[PDB]
Symmetry: D2
Subunit: 332 residues, 4 copies
C-alpha cells in the first residue's frame, strides 16, 4: 500500500480533455514572455510549449513548473512532438527563421514557409478547432502563410500585427500629455513596420479629438512634430534591440491581452492583422491591421475606419508590396 | 497655446513623491524576472531599475514601459545613479559577481563585498526606511554582508534563502501525490544549497503527517526514496542552467510572493534567510532559512521549528561553515 | 443601413456557445455575494442568475450588468426559466426556505426538498454535465437531496459543507497567533453545524504540530481553551445574524474559492461535503465534510484523515443523525 | 510557557503606520458594495468602516473578517468613533439623508449639511491629508458641502459624479453595437441626475466618430433614437430600485475603479465632480462632472471638452440651480 494510496482515496479516472488550453510555439525570448504573461493572467488551465531545440524547451518548461506554487495553471507541458499541443483553444506562433547577412526578404519568407509547412499541419492535426495567433516576423506575410497552409477560415487566423505598435503609440501619447495610456486613444493600422499608418483623426482623450484642436496634427508643418511619435513607434523595437539585444516584455504583455479577449470571449476591439481583400480597395489575399472584434471564434467582426485618401493609398501600397512577395512563394 | 494646454487644464503642481516604490538591482535574467512578476501583480506604483551596464539597463526600462497600457504601475525609471531609487519601500538585490575558474568561495564573497560597499550605502542613503531583500548568491552569506554594511536592524534585511527550494519541494511533492502545490505542505530550511534540510516531520496534506503515515520517509530504507525529491530540489538550478543556460521564471515568482507579503503587510510565513544566533545552539552572526512572518517592517517574528538532533546538527554545521567564510571578510 | 452596419463589418454568425458558464440559483444575500465574488475573480465567460421572484431577479441582473465596464465577464443573464442556464459548467444552488415560528426542523427540510424537486430537474435538463455546488441549509442533507434527485455520480455533487467553517477557524487561529490565516492550518470536518469536528492533530503553522507542542490542545483541561475557538466557529453565523440580520460576504468568498478550483481544475484540497459511505464505518448514503481534491470533474479524490476513536465516533453519530432525517424525506 | 511561546519567537516591533488605508463611511448597501469591491481589488492594507449603528457595523466588519482567508487585506476595523479611521489615504462618504414626502430640495440639503458637520470635521481630524470621495446624493451639492466644511483644497475633494452614468452609457452602447464596453467610448457630464449631458461628439469606437457617421445621433430625428440610451442612463438607478429595492453592485464597482486610480496614482481620466468655477461661463462655486485626471493628490488636471452651445447652456443652468440652493445654506 503506497503512501499516496494510504493518504488519498481515488474515486475518478481521467478524461484527457482540458478546457482552456493555450499552446505557445517557439520558446525564444518572445515566446517565453508570451508564456509568463499568460500564466500570470490566469488565462489557461493547461499550457503547452513546443520548439525544435530539446534541452532549451525542457529547461524552460521546468523553470515555469518550479513556479507552480505561485500560479493558477496546474498543467505545464512541453515536447518536440506536437501531440502535446492537443485540444488547444489558442496556439500562439513565435517561431521563425533569423535573417542572414546577404539574404533577401523573399528568401527569408520562403524559409519561414518551409518551417510553417511542418508546424502548421501538426497544429491543425492535434487541435482542429483552435485559433492561430501569429507573432513571427514578418507577421503580415506569415499570417497569410499560416492561413493558406492550415486551410482555416479567416476568422480563426489572426496576426499580432499592429497591436503593440498601437500600445507604444499610446504610451508615447501619454508621456506627452501626462495621462495614462488607458485614457489616451489612437490607432496604428496597416502593415506592421515602417509603412504603418497612424490614424490622426481617431486620436483623442475623453472624446476630445486632437485633430479638431490641432488641425496640423501629424503633418510636416506641425510645430510640435507629432509625426515623430509615430517614427518612434516604428523605430522602437530596433532601438530596444540595439540597447539590450532583443525585445520581449511589451510583446509578451501585448499577446497576453489578445489571448485574454479570445479566451474569455470579451469582444473587445484590437488592432490585429486580418485578411482584408474587399476593403480599402485591396483586391489581393493580404493581411493588414484593422480594429477587430476578438472573441472565442477569433475575429468575429471588424470596424470600418474612415480613412483619408492619403491613408487609404498607404494601405493599398502596403498590400501591393505584400502580394509582390507572397506571389513568389512556393507552397508545393 | 499648445495642444496639451488647450486640452488639459492644470490645477496643481506638487513635488511627486511615490508611495509603494520598489527598486530591483541588477537587470540580469533574475532581476528582470523579479521585475515582470512584480509588475503583473500590481505590487508597486513606481518600479526602479539600477545596474552598471547602461545600454542594457535602458533597453530593459523601455521594453517594460512600452507595455504600460497593459499594466497598472504608472511609472518605470532606471539609471546607474541611485538617485532614481529614492524613497523605495523595498529594494531587491539580484546583482553580484560571477565566480571565475580556480576562484575560491571566499574570494568570490570578497568580490561581492567590494561590490556591496558601493551598492548598499547608496541604497540606504536614498531610501533609509526600506527593506532589503537579497537574492544574489551565495544568498545566506550576502544577507549578512548587506546587513553589516547597511547598519539596518535584522528585521529589515531579508534573504530569499530557501523560499524557492520550498516551493520546488512542494511542486515535486505535488507531482507524486496528484495534488496542487498550494495544498502540499513541506519546508526546506537552513542553508540555501547542498546542505539544506528537508523537514520530513512537517510534511503534510490536509494536516495529515506523511511521516506518521509512512515512518521510513526521507530515510535510506524508504522504498519510495523521498530523499530523491530533496536531491532534485538541491540540483534544480544546476539542471536548469544545463538545459537552458540560466534560471529566471521560478525565482522571479518566488521573489514577487515575498514582495506581496511585505508591501501588503500580510504577515504570511515564508522560509527566508534571517539572523538566527540564539536558535539551535548557534552562537555566531549567521543567516539561515527559518519560517518567518513578513509584513511592512520586514521580519517581525519567526517560527521555532522542532528539529531532530540530526537535522539540528546540519543547521549547526552549516552555521559553522557560513561563519568560517564570514569571519575572513574585510569591510574596512 | 444602420449605424452598427456602417461601423462594423460582420464576418460570421454565432455565438450562443459559452465555454465557462456558471449559474447561480437564488438571489438572496448569499447568492449575490457568490455572484459578485465570482465576477471579480474572472472565473466565468457567462453568468446566469435564477430565482422565483422576477422583479428581484431582473433588478440584480441589471445592477451587475451596469458594472460591466469594470468586469471581464461579457454576458450576464437571468430569468425564471431555466433555459437561461443551458450548458453551465458549474451550478451553485443558494435557494432555500427559512424556518417559521413553531415549525419543526423536519418540516423545514421537507420544504427545502420540495423546492429542490423543482430546481434540480430543471438544472439537469439544461446542463446535464455540470458540477453541482449546494450551499443551501441544511447543506449536508440538501447535498444528499440534490444527489438523489439529479441522478449524478457523487463526484459531480459537492456541498459547501465545512469549507467556510474551516476558513473561520483559521481566521481565529490567526488572530490568536499573530499570523495570516493563509499560514495557519486547521480543518473542521464532519457535519456543518453543532456536531462538526475540529481535527486538533492536524493543526499547525509552518509544519509544526500544535498538538505536539501543546498535548492538552482542545481537551477540557486546556489552560488556553482552544475548544472555544471551535465554539466561536460554530456560532459565528448566528452572531453575525444577530448583529446585521443575515450573512453574506464570507460565504460568498468561500464559494468563489471552490468555483476557482473547479473552473480552473487546480486540484486543491478543500473541506467540502461529499458522499462517504465506506469511510469511517458508515454504511449509509450520507454527506459530510472531509478534505477533497477539487477540479473540473468535481471531487476526484479525497484525503483519508486519520481520526482518533472519539473523532470517528462523532462522524458516525452525525451520519446516524443525518440518515434518520433523510429516510423520512418524500421525493414523490 | 504557552503554545504561542513555544511556536513563535518574537522580534522587537517597530511602529506600524498604515500605508494604504481606506475608510468607507456608511454601511448601507452602497457602502458595503464599495468595501467588498475595494477588498477584492487589493487596493488597501487596512479598511475602516464607520456608521452610527453599532450592531450593524460590527456585524458587517465580522462578516468581512470571516473571509480573510480569501483576501489579501490583513486588517479590517470598524467603529462609531472616527479614531478607527486614523491615517486614511482615501475616505469614501456614502452616508446621507433620505428625502421625506413633501420636503423641499433646500431642506433636504440642509439636513445633509448638519450631518456632514459631524462627519467631515471628524474625518479630517483623524486623517488630515486624505482625499475625500463623496458618493452621497445629491452628489454634486454634497461635494460642495464636504469641500467648504473640510477646509480642503479642491484637488482633494472628489464627487463620484457622472462616473457610473458614463459606465452605464457604455454598457448600453455596447449592447447595441455588439462590442464590449471597454472598447465603447462616450462621456456623460455635468450634473449627476436628470440634467446630465451625453456628449454625442465624443462617442466613438476605435477612434471613429458615431456622430460623423450618423449625423442625426442624439436628436429627435434619429431613427435609432440614441437619446433613449441616455434617458435609460438617467432612469437606471430609479428602475433598479423598483425592481430590487435599492442599488449597490454597479456603484460599488464604480467607486472601486476611482479608488484604483487614486491609490495607485494611475492618472486615468474619469468623469467625476469637481469645482469648475472658470469653465463654461460658470462664475460660481459649484461642482460638476468633467473628465478629470485622478492620482495620488486626487484631481490634478481636467480635460477641456468642447461642448455645443446647447451642452454648455445645460451645464450653465445646472450651475445656476446648484448655486441657488448652496447660497441659502448655513454652516
Amino acid at each position: 500500500a503506497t503512501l499516496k494510496d494510504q493518504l488519498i482515496y481515488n474515486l475518478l479516472k481521467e478524461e484527457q480533455t482540458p478546457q482552456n488550453k493555450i499552446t505557445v510555439v517557439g520558446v525564444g525570448a518572445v515566446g517565453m514572455a508570451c508564456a509568463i504573461s499568460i500564466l500570470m493572467k490566469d488565462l489557461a488551465d493547461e499550457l503547452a510549449l513546443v520548439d525544435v531545440i530539446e534541452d532549451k524547451l525542457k529547461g524552460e518548461m521546468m523553470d515555469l513548473q518550479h513556479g507552480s506554487l505561485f500560479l493558477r495553471t496546474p498543467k505545464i507541458v512541453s515536447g518536440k512532438d506536437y501531440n502535446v499541443t492537443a485540444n488547444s483553444k489558442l496556439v500562439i506562433i513565435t517561431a521563425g527563421a533569423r535573417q542572414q547577412e546577404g539574404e533577401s526578404r523573399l528568401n527569408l519568407v520562403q524559409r519561414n514557409v518551409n518551417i510553417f509547412k511542418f508546424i502548421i499541419p501538426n497544429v491543425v492535426k492535434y487541435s482542429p478547432n483552435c485559433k492561430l495567433l501569429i507573432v513571427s516576423n514578418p507577421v503580415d506575410i506569415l499570417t497569410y502563410v499560416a492561413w493558406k497552409i492550415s486551410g482555416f477560415p479567416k476568422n480563426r487566423v489572426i496576426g499580432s500585427g499592429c497591436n503593440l505598435d498601437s500600445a507604444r503609440f499610446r504610451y508615447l501619447m501619454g508621456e506627452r500629455l501626462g495621462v495614462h495610456p488607458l485614457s489616451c486613444h489612437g490607432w496604428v493600422l496597416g502593415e506592421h513596420g515602417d509603412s504603418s499608418v497612424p490614424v490622426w483623426s481617431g486620436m483623442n482623450v475623453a472624446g476630445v479629438s486632437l485633430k479638431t484642436l490641432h488641425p496640423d496634427l501629424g503633418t510636416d508643418k506641425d510645430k510640435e512634430q507629432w509625426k515623430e511619435v509615430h517614427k518612434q513607434v516604428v523605430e522602437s523595437a530596433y532601438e530596444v534591440i540595439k540597447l539590450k539585444g532583443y525585445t520581449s516584455w511589451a510583446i509578451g504583455l501585448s499577446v497576453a491581452d489578445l489571448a485574454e479577449s479570445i479566451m474569455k470571449n470579451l469582444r473587445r476591439v484590437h488592432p490585429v492583422s486580418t485578411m482584408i481583400k474587399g476593403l480599402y480597395g485591396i483586391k489581393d489575399d493580404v493581411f493588414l491591421s484593422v480594429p477587430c472584434i476578438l472573441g472565442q471564434n477569433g475575429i468575429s467582426d471588424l470596424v470600418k475606419v474612415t480613412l483619408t485618401s492619403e491613408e487609404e493609398a498607404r494601405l493599398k501600397k502596403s498590400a501591393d508590396t505584400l502580394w509582390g512577395i507572397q506571389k513568389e512563394l512556393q507552397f508545393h
